[PDB]
């Protein structure tokens, strides 16, 4: 009965994936009332249809929050709480986190900034492989920025876009997908699994980042070269970060979730496990409200991916392996 990663065993044993409780086994009020309101406002504006179908829940929650928001006082607002059985049938929901990174970069080669990011060259047909581009097969008229981190560029390839901060006065610079090199991609995840460097079930882009951070530049290039594919980008006008449902996401007030289990717009009450600067469960939870507003290729079942927000602090809070909390889905009577 492991406890290492946020697991708890105070709510008995579950038979069905959701079960009505009289009160969430959670003491206090959610700590993010403001953010939730802000998130709701974004649903209201960016997704009128979605908002119209869930507003009954959103209003109840709002009304309850304004009256003091304590978990003991939910029934008087017609709010039901369905606790989620989670990964083990002890209520312990699988939580990973994700976040918009900001790539530190500079316009000329200097200091730690020695890792180019390219725009699309007018086609030849055959563009060079990743390894060839690293060696400098490509000209320098095609560089957009030199960045701080080779692994961060890779993560930008998989995302297909990224935010770059040149460290002067100016606004964040967004770059979107422009094209590829024509060499077929191979999955850097699989490689790290087929070497035992990372376990199959803790694999995620985040885990590839941590693996990066903990290895040498040589070890990283070696690994990255295993994938001969390469992305190119172009400058794009900046846009607030939206999830699959086209609603601007609010840090720690939104999750990505499996549509067939937690339909977009579902309201969630979560005890979310806090992390060490190590990325280790630190013994503390945080009771927050969140709405399901995004999706992910490996975000299935009762697994949630919390949107931590933008930047490195959000980055830290996201972690790089599974942790566990408790969730109650909130529905109107």
Curated annotation (Swiss-Prot):
Q: Which NCBIfam families match?
A: PRK11162.1
Q: How does this chain assemble?
A: Forms a trimeric complex with MrcB/PonB and MipA in vitro.
Q: What is its EC number?
A: 4.2.2.n1
Q: Which organism is it from?
A: Escherichia coli (strain K12)
GO cellular component terms, alphabetically, are:
cell outer membrane; outer membrane-bounded periplasmic space
The UniProt entry lists membrane topology as: Lipid-anchor
Is Membrane there in the keyword field? yes
Q: What is this protein called?
A: Membrane-bound lytic murein transglycosylase A
